[PDB]
Subunit: 257 residues, 4 copies
């Protein structure tokens, strides 16, 4: 009678570490992500890599990789397949958004359309899909991964940070609107996290000089690890804490304080 | 040589009062709004009624009413017409957004698409249009009218309040990004304002008992007047204050404090 | 006839003089608290005597007060008593508060800690407890408490100053909301990078063009604010033209606190 | 070689539960609190009761109960005694403050002096005492318990909530100032917590009708438990999360969102 946790984009970012710890805490898992092996873009830990490890930890796993999470149908389909496999949805970790930077006046209509689709549509359709079963069950926990930029939308990240702030605002209203049904919805916004995506984007991957310069921008003078983040995230998804909802948590080494 | 102020949606909301005070302060005006007489929806003060008054106050007026301010072309065309008429743009008051309320899970794809177009596209394309001439001049003042809900996105107004928070976030980044060019961009978010639109929506227009209950929700126990709001708004657009940018100002009788 | 009355503290420096002029232009009589002396005395940027003549030309009666300790109940209560005695009314109050202290948190002494509480908090608590009763009784009033932009972003090297400024803003929020129903507004303005002798001397930018440029470089709008700008915003919250904001904090630092 | 965690006011509030979990996580403990049995005011779990339980969990315990934590001497002496017994200080949970409510204009000079001493002096002297050894060690984690009222200082809680906001502000600056030394300092502000103190103050301790009205004020329609709070608190003190500092975390069932 294990509870069920959904994790999207689970082939990279916090998904793998979160899956391991959520399995340690007695959860069955539905992992949405990108199909293929490590060579494929955006695959930091392949599905096949994880299935064996999570099985050892006692978790059943369902993988999903043929849905468009910027759309209603994609998210509705994803949840339909969760309920089909395990008849229940207790926790949901919705990873959203795609980075875009540059001068505000250089932003194209395509960049504007893309950032709305990744930073907002994923949140709107994601929440409209995970909530109904949680409300029906009278209990549920959701974490929406936005960005620490949402807490301080800065120059050169206008449309990305701004829409992240809108995502946090949606999460606040939704987290408060369904609190009375026993459902929690909170947002985590990270920055300066140590995973291949950020290292490649920041050009720190193979450059120690660049790495030191990036870390110097962080008050704690380091990059965050996925084990740390997964521990905090799991804390909001494992049922141990049921007294926070509609809130935004900065996780950027103090950068967003 | 008089400075020039742009005001959108100027046939209702704060536009008319703002136009009068901005003219008193020595500005020529470009008024975007709805073409018609009082009978047309969204026309609280027609162009023709205002032009006579603003002329007495010494202001030349250019009217615009055939542009789609949710698009790049509409906003770019509007500013092109401002510049051909008056060769300069000193101040811009961009009124944006359209109210939508209801349970989060009842929101349709159309409502979601509409709120993004009114609360976000208007801001993105509006700012991309007004800023270039201000940057070129090394001076400019912009106020983006969002909503007090952006400061506290609450249940029953999730996607509206949330996107308003995103609009405020964009304003913050943009206001900071172009500060070094001598350009200010700030946001004002109102609520419980005394104008026919809100009165009709709140159903208090002809019900004194209804109004007293609405006023009871406001700490200052009253509704704001457009003359008050126009005075505050003009303070951010008349050149008297050049030391605030990237900021959001709540104007809701303390409701958003 | 029947001019409204505005109280301004610390009016011999900072925003007081400019605020007094504009408030007089807007038809207010004035009570100016400040430091007694001429320009040579510390903390006197515009002496009472300098202002008395100008404000009279603008049509304002002036009462000066300079023998009260505004960190205490007695000082603030006495100040308001003397306002009501001279003009029977108090319509607006601009309470300038606080005294700068900086340095490493672990270097702060008990005296610095005691001083920052007295200037940044006691002035606000006793100031508001004194100005509010007459406003509540009249059913109308407007108050601005000058705190600091550091209250919006308490940073390293400004821990106890910025932190207590944040507490002052918090008190202003609760009080501004608590007495809103009586028709009284209480808001806070927090400034930084203002162009007045105090800041120029403190920042060491006085007579140092390179230093001045460096300080301005820290401001998004790449400049220092002027008292005429600040007094215009401040008066807007004290002249009765805007009666729909209370319990709020307004950053005034060229975007530094955005 | 166990790490050392200091917990103040450990005879009530979160202290006992936090001590248990921190012991489970391999910490030695120093508990400051009130000396006595349950009959004494403010004693919910006596020292003697806890020591036996904590000993079973593998923790050495040092008790301290004759210091005035509103003063420099009290806090410095407390930390000296911590270092004397265990030569190290890794984590510190500084519980601070004392509730006071009423109309702002009814507050006396004694109430004003008391709230400054409990809500601010405890924080200033507390941090000045715990930080030096953590800086010297190049690592440390501190949680300062303030109040959810600090996030929204409301009428009838002016001086309490306001000073709580100042405490959070100090924590932000201090948490950012010593981040480069590997030290974290964060604040947690609670409300609507289920413990005898709050139940007695709210008069709900024996009135289910009163309690049901209390829970109705909370978005999640419940009171928080110390086990939940201790789990979140321990998460910021057990070394598992070293990427948050200078931050304030609301823990009030969404009341402070």
């Amino acid at each position: 009678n294990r509870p069920v946790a959904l994790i999207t984009m689970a082939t990279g970012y916090v998904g793998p570490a979160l899956a391991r710890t959520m399995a340690d805490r007695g959860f069955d898992l539905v992992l949405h992500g990108t199909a293929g092996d490590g060579t494929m873009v955006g695959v930091e830990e392949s599905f096949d890599s994880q299935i064996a490890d999570l099985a050892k930890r006692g978790a059943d796993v369902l993988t999903i990789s043929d849905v468009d999470l910027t759309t209603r149908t994609g998210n509705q389909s994803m949840i339909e397949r969760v309920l089909e496999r395990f008849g229940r949805l207790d926790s949901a970790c919705l990873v959203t958004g795609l980075i875009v930077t540059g001068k505000f006046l250089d932003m194209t209509d395509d960049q504007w359309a893309k950032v709305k689709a990744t930073n907002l549509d994923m949140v709107f359709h994601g929440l409209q899909a995970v909530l109904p079963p949680m409300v029906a069950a009278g209990a549920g926990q959701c974490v929406v991964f936005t960005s620490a930029t949402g807490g301080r939308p800065d120059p050169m990240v206008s449309i990305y940070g701004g829409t992240r702030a809108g995502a946090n605002g949606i999460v606040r209203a939704v987290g408060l609107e369904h609190a009375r049904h026993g459902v929690q919805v909170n947002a985590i916004g990270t920055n300066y996290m140590d995973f291949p995506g950020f290292l490649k984007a920041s050009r720190a991957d193979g450059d120690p000089e660049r790495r030191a310069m990036i870390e110097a921008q962080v008050p704690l003078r380091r990059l965050g690890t996925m084990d740390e983040l997964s521990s905090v995230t799991a804390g909001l998804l494992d049922g141990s804490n049921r007294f926070q909802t509609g809130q935004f948590f900065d996780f950027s080494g103090g950068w967003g304080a």
